[PDB]
Amino acid sequence: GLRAVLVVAGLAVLLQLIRGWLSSKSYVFNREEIARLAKEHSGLDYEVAFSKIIVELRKKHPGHILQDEDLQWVFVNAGGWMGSMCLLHASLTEYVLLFGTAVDTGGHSGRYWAEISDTILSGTFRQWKEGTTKSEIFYPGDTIVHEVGEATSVQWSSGTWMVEYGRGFIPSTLAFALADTIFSTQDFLTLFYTVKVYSKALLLEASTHLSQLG
Amino acid sequence: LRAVLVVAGLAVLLQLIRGWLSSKSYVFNREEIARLAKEHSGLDYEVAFSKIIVELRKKHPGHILQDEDLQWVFVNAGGWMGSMCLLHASLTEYVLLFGTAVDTGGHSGRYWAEISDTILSGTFRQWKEGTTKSEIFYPGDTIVHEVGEATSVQWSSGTWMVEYGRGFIPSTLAFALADTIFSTQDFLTLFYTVKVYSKALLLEASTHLSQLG
Amino acid sequence: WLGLRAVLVVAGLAVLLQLIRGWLSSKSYVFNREEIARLAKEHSGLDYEVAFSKIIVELRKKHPGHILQDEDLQWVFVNAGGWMGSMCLLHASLTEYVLLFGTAVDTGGHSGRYWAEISDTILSGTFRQWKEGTTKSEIFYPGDTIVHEVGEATSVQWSSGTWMVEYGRGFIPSTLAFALADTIFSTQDFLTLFYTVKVYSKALLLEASTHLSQLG
Ligand SMILES: O=C(OCCN1CCOCC1)C1(c2ccccc2)CCCCC1
Ligand SMILES: O=C(OCCN1CCOCC1)C1(c2ccccc2)CCCCC1
Ligand SMILES: O=C(OCCN1CCOCC1)C1(c2ccccc2)CCCCC1
Ligand SMILES: CCCCCCCCO[C@@H]1O[C@H](CO)[C@@H](O)[C@H](O)[C@H]1O
Known part of the structure; x- marks a missing residue:
C-alpha cells in the first residue's frame, strides 16, 4: 500500500513542520507575563483589575490589543459549561482574553494542541x-x-473571573468552542458575536504586520 | 441588487408576522399569569399548582388540557434539566408549569418569543x-x-414556577429538543413532548371550530 | 399493499425483540446486583480508595478470569447526559459490566434510558435521584x-468526591449512544473516546478468552 504510507508520511511531515515552526516562532506575549500582570492586580475588584490589566497590556504591547469600542462580553458555551469572554488579542498562535462566569458551572476543559493559562482575579477554580x-x-x-x-474537568463558582492566555495552534480549539452552540444552545447570534470579535482581532494583527513593514 | 431584494423580502415577511402578532387576540397575557402565580406563591408549590390549573380552566374554558392529559415531562435544553407540565399551547401562546428538583443551569435560549416566569418556590439566578x-x-x-435576548439561567433543587410564552412558538422547538437529540438520547421523552404539544394544538383547533360552528 | 410492508417491519422487529428478551431471560450471568451491592456496602465504611482495592481483590478471587488485571485498569472520563464523571472498568460483556464510577466535581444531568438495569452502591459522597x-x-x-x-429515566446529581461501585445487566450495546454522545457533540475529546473503546475491547476479549479456556 504505497498510497497509505504516503498519507502517513505526509500527515507526519505536516505535523513536524507546524511543530518546528511553533518552537522557533516569536511571540507577542508569554504565559508568565500575563500571569504576573493578572496576579499583581488580583487583590482589587475584578472590574477595576480588568481596567488596569487592559491599560497595562495596551501600554506594553501597542497595536496588539483591541480598542474599547471593540471590546464586548460574549457568552461562551462549551464542554457543558457556560461562561463569558472579552477578547483582547488573537492570532493564529496566541490569544489573550478575560474569562469568567456569574453562575456556577463546570464541565470538560477540552483537549487541544495549545497551552492555556488562567490566573484568577476573583472566585474559585476547581480543576x-x-x-x-x-x-x-x-x-x-x-x-x-x-x-x-491534556484534558481536565473545570468548575467555577458564581463570580469567578480570570485572565487567560493561549499559545499553540489556536484553530485546534474552534470545534470545542462551537459544539455546544451547534448542538445545544442554538444561539447563533452569540456565534456571530464570537466570529465578529475574532475576525476583528485577526485583522488587527494583520494590520500591525503590514504597518511594521510599511 | 439580488441580495438587497432578499433582505427586503425577509423584511416584508418579518413585518407581516410582527404586525399580526401585535394586532392578534390572545387567550392569556403574561401579566395575568404572573399575578395568578404570585397570588398562590405563598403556599406549597404542588397545592398552588392545583389551584392555578383550576383557576385557568375557570377563566379560559376550552383552552387548557384536562387532568388526564397533564403529565410531567423532562426538559433537557441549553445544558440544564427540568420538567414541564403543559397546560396550553398554540402557534403564538403557551402556558406551562416548569421547574426542577435538582440543581441545574445553562443557556436560556434565544427565540422570537417573550417568555415570563413567576417563581412559586426556590431560587432563580439570571x-x-x-x-x-x-x-x-x-x-x-x-x-x-x-x-x-439570551441569558444564563440557574435553578436550585425544588425550584418551581409558572411560565407563559407569547410570540412565534415554533421558534423554540429546536432549542427544546437539542439536548435530547445530541445528549440524552431519551427519545421516549421526545415522544412525550411531541404528544403533549399535539394534544394542546388539537384542543385549540377544536375550540376554535366549536366557537365558530 | 404498503400496509403489508409496514406490518412486516413491525412484526420482524417484534420477533427480534422477543428473541433478545428470551435470550436475556434464560442466560447465565457471572455477577448479580445483590452480590455487587452487598460487597460494596461491606466496604462502604472505609475510604473509597481502600474500598476500591478491597472490592477489586474480592471480585477477582470470587470470579477469576472475568476481571481485568492491574495493568489494564485506568481512570477514563465519562461525559454523558450533561454530567461529567470517571470510570474504571473491571468487567464488561454484551450482557454485563462492572466498573468503579464517581466524580471529583459537582455534576448532574440525565441518567439515560437503555435496555439494561444498572445498580450503584455508594462508597462516598451523595447521590441525588x-x-x-x-x-x-x-x-x-x-x-x-x-x-x-x-x-426508566431519572435525573442524577452528585456532589464533589462521590464514588460508587456499578453493575449493569441487560443489553449493554443499548448504552453506547448515551455513553458517547457528549463526546461527539460537545467535548470533542476523541482520545477519551479511544480510551473507552480500548478498555471495553479489553474486557470483551477477556470474556472471550475465558470461555475459550473453559472449553479448551
Ligand atoms: O473562551 C475560551 O476560553 C474558555 C476556557 N476556559 C475554560 C476552560 O479552562 C480554561 C478557560 C475558549 C475560546 C473562545 C473563543 C474562541 C476560541 C476559544 C478558549 C479555550 C477553551 C475553549 C473556549
Ligand atoms: O420548557 C420550556 O421552559 C423552559 C424555561 N426555562 C428555561 C428557559 O428559560 C426560561 C425558563 C421551554 C419550551 C419547551 C417546549 C416547547 C416550548 C418551549 C420554553 C422556553 C424556554 C426553554 C424551553
Ligand atoms: O459510565 C457509565 O456508568 C456510570 C453510569 N452511572 C451514572 C448514571 O447513573 C447510573 C450510573 C456508563 C457507560 C460508560 C461507557 C460505556 C458504557 C456505559 C454506563 C451507563 C450509564 C452512564 C454511562
Ligand atoms: C441559584 C442558586 C443560588 C445558590 C445560593 C446563592 C447565594 C448567593 O450567591 C451569590 O449570588 C449573587 C447573585 O448571582 C452572585 O453575584 C454572587 O457571586 C454569589 O456568591
Missing part, C-alpha cells in the same frame, strides 16, 4: 486532572495551566 | 448578556426573557 | 444502593 480521583481548588492569585494534549 | 453580575429571584418575582 | 413524573428528589448516602431500572 480535576485526568487519571486521578481527587481535585484541587484554586483561589485569586493562582495560575492553572491546561497543558498541551 | 445572568444577562453583556454583564459580569447575575441576580437571584425569589417566590413572587417574575423574570421576563425578552425577545432576542 | 429525581425520578420521572415527580416533583421531589431524594439524597442517598454511603451504604445505600440506587437501582436504575430498565426503561
Whole structure:
C-alpha cells in the first residue's frame, strides 16, 4: 500500500513542520507575563483589575490589543459549561482574553494542541486532572495551566473571573468552542458575536504586520 | 441588487408576522399569569399548582388540557434539566408549569418569543448578556426573557414556577429538543413532548371550530 | 399493499425483540446486583480508595478470569447526559459490566434510558435521584444502593468526591449512544473516546478468552 504510507508520511511531515515552526516562532506575549500582570492586580475588584490589566497590556504591547469600542462580553458555551469572554488579542498562535462566569458551572476543559493559562482575579477554580480521583481548588492569585494534549474537568463558582492566555495552534480549539452552540444552545447570534470579535482581532494583527513593514 | 431584494423580502415577511402578532387576540397575557402565580406563591408549590390549573380552566374554558392529559415531562435544553407540565399551547401562546428538583443551569435560549416566569418556590439566578453580575429571584418575582435576548439561567433543587410564552412558538422547538437529540438520547421523552404539544394544538383547533360552528 | 410492508417491519422487529428478551431471560450471568451491592456496602465504611482495592481483590478471587488485571485498569472520563464523571472498568460483556464510577466535581444531568438495569452502591459522597413524573428528589448516602431500572429515566446529581461501585445487566450495546454522545457533540475529546473503546475491547476479549479456556 504505497498510497497509505504516503498519507502517513505526509500527515507526519505536516505535523513536524507546524511543530518546528511553533518552537522557533516569536511571540507577542508569554504565559508568565500575563500571569504576573493578572496576579499583581488580583487583590482589587475584578472590574477595576480588568481596567488596569487592559491599560497595562495596551501600554506594553501597542497595536496588539483591541480598542474599547471593540471590546464586548460574549457568552461562551462549551464542554457543558457556560461562561463569558472579552477578547483582547488573537492570532493564529496566541490569544489573550478575560474569562469568567456569574453562575456556577463546570464541565470538560477540552483537549487541544495549545497551552492555556488562567490566573484568577476573583472566585474559585476547581480543576480535576485526568487519571486521578481527587481535585484541587484554586483561589485569586493562582495560575492553572491546561497543558498541551491534556484534558481536565473545570468548575467555577458564581463570580469567578480570570485572565487567560493561549499559545499553540489556536484553530485546534474552534470545534470545542462551537459544539455546544451547534448542538445545544442554538444561539447563533452569540456565534456571530464570537466570529465578529475574532475576525476583528485577526485583522488587527494583520494590520500591525503590514504597518511594521510599511 | 439580488441580495438587497432578499433582505427586503425577509423584511416584508418579518413585518407581516410582527404586525399580526401585535394586532392578534390572545387567550392569556403574561401579566395575568404572573399575578395568578404570585397570588398562590405563598403556599406549597404542588397545592398552588392545583389551584392555578383550576383557576385557568375557570377563566379560559376550552383552552387548557384536562387532568388526564397533564403529565410531567423532562426538559433537557441549553445544558440544564427540568420538567414541564403543559397546560396550553398554540402557534403564538403557551402556558406551562416548569421547574426542577435538582440543581441545574445553562443557556436560556434565544427565540422570537417573550417568555415570563413567576417563581412559586426556590431560587432563580439570571445572568444577562453583556454583564459580569447575575441576580437571584425569589417566590413572587417574575423574570421576563425578552425577545432576542439570551441569558444564563440557574435553578436550585425544588425550584418551581409558572411560565407563559407569547410570540412565534415554533421558534423554540429546536432549542427544546437539542439536548435530547445530541445528549440524552431519551427519545421516549421526545415522544412525550411531541404528544403533549399535539394534544394542546388539537384542543385549540377544536375550540376554535366549536366557537365558530 | 404498503400496509403489508409496514406490518412486516413491525412484526420482524417484534420477533427480534422477543428473541433478545428470551435470550436475556434464560442466560447465565457471572455477577448479580445483590452480590455487587452487598460487597460494596461491606466496604462502604472505609475510604473509597481502600474500598476500591478491597472490592477489586474480592471480585477477582470470587470470579477469576472475568476481571481485568492491574495493568489494564485506568481512570477514563465519562461525559454523558450533561454530567461529567470517571470510570474504571473491571468487567464488561454484551450482557454485563462492572466498573468503579464517581466524580471529583459537582455534576448532574440525565441518567439515560437503555435496555439494561444498572445498580450503584455508594462508597462516598451523595447521590441525588429525581425520578420521572415527580416533583421531589431524594439524597442517598454511603451504604445505600440506587437501582436504575430498565426503561426508566431519572435525573442524577452528585456532589464533589462521590464514588460508587456499578453493575449493569441487560443489553449493554443499548448504552453506547448515551455513553458517547457528549463526546461527539460537545467535548470533542476523541482520545477519551479511544480510551473507552480500548478498555471495553479489553474486557470483551477477556470474556472471550475465558470461555475459550473453559472449553479448551
Ligand atoms: O473562551 C475560551 O476560553 C474558555 C476556557 N476556559 C475554560 C476552560 O479552562 C480554561 C478557560 C475558549 C475560546 C473562545 C473563543 C474562541 C476560541 C476559544 C478558549 C479555550 C477553551 C475553549 C473556549
Ligand atoms: O420548557 C420550556 O421552559 C423552559 C424555561 N426555562 C428555561 C428557559 O428559560 C426560561 C425558563 C421551554 C419550551 C419547551 C417546549 C416547547 C416550548 C418551549 C420554553 C422556553 C424556554 C426553554 C424551553
Ligand atoms: O459510565 C457509565 O456508568 C456510570 C453510569 N452511572 C451514572 C448514571 O447513573 C447510573 C450510573 C456508563 C457507560 C460508560 C461507557 C460505556 C458504557 C456505559 C454506563 C451507563 C450509564 C452512564 C454511562
Ligand atoms: C441559584 C442558586 C443560588 C445558590 C445560593 C446563592 C447565594 C448567593 O450567591 C451569590 O449570588 C449573587 C447573585 O448571582 C452572585 O453575584 C454572587 O457571586 C454569589 O456568591
